Amino acid sequence: GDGWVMSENGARFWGRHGAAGLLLRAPMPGGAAAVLLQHRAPWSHQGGTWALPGGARDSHETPEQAAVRAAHAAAGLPAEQLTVRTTVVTAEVAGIGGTQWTYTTVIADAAEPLHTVPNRESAELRWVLEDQVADLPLHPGFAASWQRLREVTATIPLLNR
């Protein structure tokens, strides 16, 4: 999204069209829901913490496309193996001069926990039971949103058939 947005409070944010991340859900044989998280490599933004695979939204892309593309880049996930459910704006910043920055969480489902090939800033990818996500050292942006995302996820159960 090649550039900065400057906030009203004077911090810069990367990506003119904001960013998007994939919250990908999968059922366990147990039957409970897991989510796929990315452990951020120390050399990347907020390295040492866990968050969603995501990146900057491009000019011609929907938030959904951006998050799915980011998940492919970070984890090798094929789009055909997942199903996008909805989007939630999890962060919104008043930029200087009318402009805006947002982060959009794109909730999606897979039929089972998928095999991943780590690349980019994927130090690790790990399927984490939904109830255990908040036990981890989370990216502070993600952690600020997590409870709200849970409330939303609980109103759309995973698909079948």
PDB file of C-alpha atoms in Angstrom:
ATOM      1  CA  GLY A   1       0.000   0.000   0.000  1.00  0.00           C
ATOM      2  CA  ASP A   2       3.231   1.864  -0.541  1.00  0.00           C
ATOM      3  CA  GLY A   3       3.102   4.756   1.933  1.00  0.00           C
ATOM      4  CA  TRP A   4       2.382   6.273   5.278  1.00  0.00           C
ATOM      5  CA  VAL A   5      -0.695   7.638   6.841  1.00  0.00           C
ATOM      6  CA  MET A   6      -0.044  10.118   9.678  1.00  0.00           C
ATOM      7  CA  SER A   7      -2.573  10.130  12.550  1.00  0.00           C
ATOM      8  CA  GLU A   8      -4.124  13.081  14.323  1.00  0.00           C
ATOM      9  CA  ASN A   9      -2.053  12.088  17.409  1.00  0.00           C
ATOM     10  CA  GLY A  10       1.126  12.149  15.231  1.00  0.00           C
ATOM     11  CA  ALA A  11       2.067   8.482  14.701  1.00  0.00           C
ATOM     12  CA  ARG A  12       2.588   7.069  11.214  1.00  0.00           C
ATOM     13  CA  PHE A  13       0.827   3.923   9.956  1.00  0.00           C
ATOM     14  CA  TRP A  14       1.919   1.878   7.004  1.00  0.00           C
ATOM     15  CA  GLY A  15      -0.369   1.453   4.009  1.00  0.00           C
ATOM     16  CA  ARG A  16      -2.555   4.086   2.463  1.00  0.00           C
ATOM     17  CA  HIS A  17      -5.528   1.731   2.139  1.00  0.00           C
ATOM     18  CA  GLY A  18      -5.016   0.200   5.564  1.00  0.00           C
ATOM     19  CA  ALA A  19      -4.230  -3.370   6.325  1.00  0.00           C
ATOM     20  CA  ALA A  20      -6.116  -6.626   6.675  1.00  0.00           C
ATOM     21  CA  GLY A  21      -5.545  -9.905   8.511  1.00  0.00           C
ATOM     22  CA  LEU A  22      -6.994 -13.392   8.283  1.00  0.00           C
ATOM     23  CA  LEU A  23      -8.623 -14.984  11.323  1.00  0.00           C
ATOM     24  CA  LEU A  24      -8.841 -18.495   9.963  1.00  0.00           C
ATOM     25  CA  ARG A  25     -10.885 -20.992  12.063  1.00  0.00           C
ATOM     26  CA  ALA A  26     -10.752 -24.783  12.018  1.00  0.00           C
ATOM     27  CA  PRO A  27     -12.559 -27.508  13.956  1.00  0.00           C
ATOM     28  CA  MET A  28     -10.475 -29.884  16.022  1.00  0.00           C
ATOM     29  CA  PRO A  29     -11.212 -33.646  16.034  1.00  0.00           C
ATOM     30  CA  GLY A  30     -12.289 -32.763  19.611  1.00  0.00           C
ATOM     31  CA  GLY A  31     -14.845 -30.552  17.879  1.00  0.00           C
ATOM     32  CA  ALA A  32     -13.764 -27.221  19.384  1.00  0.00           C
ATOM     33  CA  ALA A  33     -12.529 -24.359  17.262  1.00  0.00           C
ATOM     34  CA  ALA A  34      -8.856 -23.487  16.628  1.00  0.00           C
ATOM     35  CA  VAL A  35      -7.431 -20.348  15.005  1.00  0.00           C
ATOM     36  CA  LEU A  36      -4.233 -20.021  13.011  1.00  0.00           C
ATOM     37  CA  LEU A  37      -1.784 -17.581  14.500  1.00  0.00           C
ATOM     38  CA  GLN A  38       1.513 -16.228  13.379  1.00  0.00           C
ATOM     39  CA  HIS A  39       4.480 -15.741  15.723  1.00  0.00           C
ATOM     40  CA  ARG A  40       6.198 -12.603  14.551  1.00  0.00           C
ATOM     41  CA  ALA A  41       9.966 -12.940  13.849  1.00  0.00           C
ATOM     42  CA  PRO A  42      11.964 -10.424  16.114  1.00  0.00           C
ATOM     43  CA  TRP A  43      13.223  -8.535  12.988  1.00  0.00           C
ATOM     44  CA  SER A  44       9.573  -7.715  11.970  1.00  0.00           C
ATOM     45  CA  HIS A  45       7.022  -5.235  13.432  1.00  0.00           C
ATOM     46  CA  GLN A  46       6.269  -6.350  16.983  1.00  0.00           C
ATOM     47  CA  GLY A  47       8.500  -9.469  16.677  1.00  0.00           C
ATOM     48  CA  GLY A  48       8.113 -11.896  19.619  1.00  0.00           C
ATOM     49  CA  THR A  49       4.294 -11.606  19.684  1.00  0.00           C
ATOM     50  CA  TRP A  50       1.412 -13.489  18.096  1.00  0.00           C
ATOM     51  CA  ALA A  51      -1.085 -11.968  15.643  1.00  0.00           C
ATOM     52  CA  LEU A  52      -2.961 -12.775  12.440  1.00  0.00           C
ATOM     53  CA  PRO A  53      -1.173 -13.219   9.134  1.00  0.00           C
ATOM     54  CA  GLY A  54      -1.955 -10.011   7.312  1.00  0.00           C
ATOM     55  CA  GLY A  55      -0.545  -7.172   5.335  1.00  0.00           C
ATOM     56  CA  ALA A  56      -1.252  -3.949   3.534  1.00  0.00           C
ATOM     57  CA  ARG A  57      -4.274  -3.593   1.347  1.00  0.00           C
ATOM     58  CA  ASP A  58      -3.587  -2.811  -2.285  1.00  0.00           C
ATOM     59  CA  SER A  59      -5.519  -0.186  -4.330  1.00  0.00           C
ATOM     60  CA  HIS A  60      -7.614  -2.629  -6.305  1.00  0.00           C
ATOM     61  CA  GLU A  61      -8.271  -5.183  -3.515  1.00  0.00           C
ATOM     62  CA  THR A  62     -11.033  -5.812  -1.090  1.00  0.00           C
ATOM     63  CA  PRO A  63     -10.026  -6.364   2.537  1.00  0.00           C
ATOM     64  CA  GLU A  64     -10.947 -10.051   1.918  1.00  0.00           C
ATOM     65  CA  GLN A  65      -8.587 -10.387  -1.011  1.00  0.00           C
ATOM     66  CA  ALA A  66      -5.804  -8.697   0.850  1.00  0.00           C
ATOM     67  CA  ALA A  67      -6.053 -11.030   3.871  1.00  0.00           C
ATOM     68  CA  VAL A  68      -6.279 -14.181   1.775  1.00  0.00           C
ATOM     69  CA  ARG A  69      -3.257 -13.052  -0.327  1.00  0.00           C
ATOM     70  CA  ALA A  70      -1.313 -12.290   2.877  1.00  0.00           C
ATOM     71  CA  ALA A  71      -2.167 -15.729   4.285  1.00  0.00           C
ATOM     72  CA  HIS A  72      -0.905 -17.397   1.103  1.00  0.00           C
ATOM     73  CA  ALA A  73       2.376 -15.418   1.307  1.00  0.00           C
ATOM     74  CA  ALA A  74       3.008 -16.187   4.987  1.00  0.00           C
ATOM     75  CA  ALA A  75       1.718 -19.765   5.214  1.00  0.00           C
ATOM     76  CA  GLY A  76       1.271 -21.228   1.701  1.00  0.00           C
ATOM     77  CA  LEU A  77      -2.471 -21.625   2.247  1.00  0.00           C
ATOM     78  CA  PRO A  78      -4.461 -22.082  -0.965  1.00  0.00           C
ATOM     79  CA  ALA A  79      -7.510 -19.870  -1.278  1.00  0.00           C
ATOM     80  CA  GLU A  80      -9.545 -22.877  -2.481  1.00  0.00           C
ATOM     81  CA  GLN A  81      -9.094 -24.551   0.930  1.00  0.00           C
ATOM     82  CA  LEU A  82     -10.770 -21.727   2.837  1.00  0.00           C
ATOM     83  CA  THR A  83     -14.089 -19.902   3.015  1.00  0.00           C
ATOM     84  CA  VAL A  84     -14.357 -16.216   3.877  1.00  0.00           C
ATOM     85  CA  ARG A  85     -17.207 -15.511   6.321  1.00  0.00           C
ATOM     86  CA  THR A  86     -17.187 -11.798   7.150  1.00  0.00           C
ATOM     87  CA  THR A  87     -15.011  -8.723   7.864  1.00  0.00           C
ATOM     88  CA  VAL A  88     -14.733  -6.725  11.135  1.00  0.00           C
ATOM     89  CA  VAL A  89     -13.047  -3.315  11.343  1.00  0.00           C
ATOM     90  CA  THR A  90     -10.850  -3.884  14.430  1.00  0.00           C
ATOM     91  CA  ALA A  91      -8.948  -0.572  14.297  1.00  0.00           C
ATOM     92  CA  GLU A  92      -9.756   2.859  12.907  1.00  0.00           C
ATOM     93  CA  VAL A  93      -7.519   5.925  13.031  1.00  0.00           C
ATOM     94  CA  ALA A  94      -8.295   9.487  12.145  1.00  0.00           C
ATOM     95  CA  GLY A  95      -5.433  10.521   9.823  1.00  0.00           C
ATOM     96  CA  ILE A  96      -4.278  14.101   9.085  1.00  0.00           C
ATOM     97  CA  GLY A  97      -6.087  15.841   6.243  1.00  0.00           C
ATOM     98  CA  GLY A  98      -9.307  13.843   6.127  1.00  0.00           C
ATOM     99  CA  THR A  99      -7.503  10.530   5.578  1.00  0.00           C
ATOM    100  CA  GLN A 100      -8.026   7.263   7.391  1.00  0.00           C
ATOM    101  CA  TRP A 101      -6.262   4.123   8.378  1.00  0.00           C
ATOM    102  CA  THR A 102      -7.974   0.903   9.310  1.00  0.00           C
ATOM    103  CA  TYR A 103      -7.220  -2.654  10.126  1.00  0.00           C
ATOM    104  CA  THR A 104      -9.792  -5.168   8.968  1.00  0.00           C
ATOM    105  CA  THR A 105     -10.032  -8.668  10.380  1.00  0.00           C
ATOM    106  CA  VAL A 106     -11.328 -11.128   7.858  1.00  0.00           C
ATOM    107  CA  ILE A 107     -12.887 -14.185   9.534  1.00  0.00           C
ATOM    108  CA  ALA A 108     -12.674 -17.394   7.504  1.00  0.00           C
ATOM    109  CA  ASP A 109     -13.195 -21.149   7.950  1.00  0.00           C
ATOM    110  CA  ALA A 110     -11.298 -24.261   6.844  1.00  0.00           C
ATOM    111  CA  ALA A 111     -12.621 -27.854   7.019  1.00  0.00           C
ATOM    112  CA  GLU A 112      -9.728 -29.002   9.285  1.00  0.00           C
ATOM    113  CA  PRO A 113      -6.454 -27.649  10.602  1.00  0.00           C
ATOM    114  CA  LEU A 114      -4.331 -27.058   7.455  1.00  0.00           C
ATOM    115  CA  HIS A 115      -0.630 -27.799   6.878  1.00  0.00           C
ATOM    116  CA  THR A 116       1.301 -24.555   6.467  1.00  0.00           C
ATOM    117  CA  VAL A 117       4.647 -23.770   4.830  1.00  0.00           C
ATOM    118  CA  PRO A 118       6.163 -20.824   6.776  1.00  0.00           C
ATOM    119  CA  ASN A 119       7.739 -17.969   4.820  1.00  0.00           C
ATOM    120  CA  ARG A 120       8.270 -14.179   5.214  1.00  0.00           C
ATOM    121  CA  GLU A 121       7.982 -13.149   8.961  1.00  0.00           C
ATOM    122  CA  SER A 122       6.464 -16.548   9.947  1.00  0.00           C
ATOM    123  CA  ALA A 123       8.804 -17.607  12.700  1.00  0.00           C
ATOM    124  CA  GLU A 124       6.066 -20.073  13.495  1.00  0.00           C
ATOM    125  CA  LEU A 125       2.445 -20.630  12.579  1.00  0.00           C
ATOM    126  CA  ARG A 126       0.359 -22.464  15.083  1.00  0.00           C
ATOM    127  CA  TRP A 127      -3.203 -23.633  15.382  1.00  0.00           C
ATOM    128  CA  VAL A 128      -4.390 -22.418  18.803  1.00  0.00           C
ATOM    129  CA  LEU A 129      -7.642 -23.315  20.542  1.00  0.00           C
ATOM    130  CA  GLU A 130      -9.855 -20.200  20.645  1.00  0.00           C
ATOM    131  CA  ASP A 131     -10.074 -20.383  24.472  1.00  0.00           C
ATOM    132  CA  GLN A 132      -6.254 -20.442  24.658  1.00  0.00           C
ATOM    133  CA  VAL A 133      -5.457 -17.551  22.270  1.00  0.00           C
ATOM    134  CA  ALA A 134      -5.428 -14.948  25.115  1.00  0.00           C
ATOM    135  CA  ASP A 135      -2.879 -17.013  27.061  1.00  0.00           C
ATOM    136  CA  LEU A 136      -0.250 -16.071  24.475  1.00  0.00           C
ATOM    137  CA  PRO A 137       1.839 -12.883  24.272  1.00  0.00           C
ATOM    138  CA  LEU A 138      -0.322 -11.146  21.705  1.00  0.00           C
ATOM    139  CA  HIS A 139       0.422  -8.263  19.391  1.00  0.00           C
ATOM    140  CA  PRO A 140      -1.036  -5.360  21.493  1.00  0.00           C
ATOM    141  CA  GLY A 141      -3.349  -4.267  18.606  1.00  0.00           C
ATOM    142  CA  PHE A 142      -4.686  -7.768  18.221  1.00  0.00           C
ATOM    143  CA  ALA A 143      -5.059  -8.283  21.985  1.00  0.00           C
ATOM    144  CA  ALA A 144      -7.074  -5.057  22.203  1.00  0.00           C
ATOM    145  CA  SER A 145      -9.481  -6.557  19.652  1.00  0.00           C
ATOM    146  CA  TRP A 146      -9.485 -10.186  20.639  1.00  0.00           C
ATOM    147  CA  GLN A 147     -12.457 -10.227  23.039  1.00  0.00           C
ATOM    148  CA  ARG A 148     -14.558  -8.341  20.534  1.00  0.00           C
ATOM    149  CA  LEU A 149     -13.557 -10.810  17.750  1.00  0.00           C
ATOM    150  CA  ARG A 150     -14.590 -13.682  20.014  1.00  0.00           C
ATOM    151  CA  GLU A 151     -18.049 -12.157  20.501  1.00  0.00           C
ATOM    152  CA  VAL A 152     -18.317 -11.898  16.738  1.00  0.00           C
ATOM    153  CA  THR A 153     -16.977 -15.379  16.034  1.00  0.00           C
ATOM    154  CA  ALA A 154     -19.522 -16.844  18.488  1.00  0.00           C
ATOM    155  CA  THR A 155     -22.349 -15.459  16.363  1.00  0.00           C
ATOM    156  CA  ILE A 156     -21.163 -17.374  13.240  1.00  0.00           C
ATOM    157  CA  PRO A 157     -20.508 -21.070  13.861  1.00  0.00           C
ATOM    158  CA  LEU A 158     -18.233 -22.956  11.507  1.00  0.00           C
ATOM    159  CA  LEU A 159     -19.731 -24.419   8.366  1.00  0.00           C
ATOM    160  CA  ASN A 160     -20.138 -27.984   7.210  1.00  0.00           C
ATOM    161  CA  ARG A 161     -21.117 -29.953   4.085  1.00  0.00           C
TER     162      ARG A 161
END
